[PDB]
Amino acid sequence: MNFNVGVDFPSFIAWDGEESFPVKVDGFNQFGFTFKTIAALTAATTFNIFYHEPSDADPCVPGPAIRVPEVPFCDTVLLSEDGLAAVTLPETVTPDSFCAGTVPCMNGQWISIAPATGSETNAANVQITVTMKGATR
């Protein structure tokens, strides 16, 4: 008795290990990532979060990537190094074990993921997808 769960909480790929893919979240109202590795990585890699805008040449295809300025929570002691958001998979994370992260507030219609400098050759294994939970239409 497994409900068709695609409609009402679908999901899309955000990083296949070779190249990102911009996902449109406009449709829904909430979302979050599910990090997952396929092989034991070397170090504590780190990804960057970008958000796109509707390019006015065709208001369906996203525009260039702008990086999201993460907000510090009530009790974040050690906080951003330039203001811009980031995310770091902790080293010594095993396969067959996922994580789950999300940005507290979106600022566009698209959400993109790309590995920061110095972690590409190690981020060629981890997979990243995004799920949503609304309809709004």
Partner: protein
């Protein structure tokens, strides 16, 4: 900020050993010999 939340899918059980005190060996048997 991203608050990661990681769960494990499989789990190998915690394999441990059960040591028990050995047979009593005394320390000085009197009617002994060199």
């Amino acid at each position: 900020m991203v608050k990661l939340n990681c769960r494990p899918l499989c789990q190998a059980p915690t394999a441990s050993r059960l040591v028990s005190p050995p047979c009593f060996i005394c320390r000085g048997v009197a009617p002994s010999a060199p």
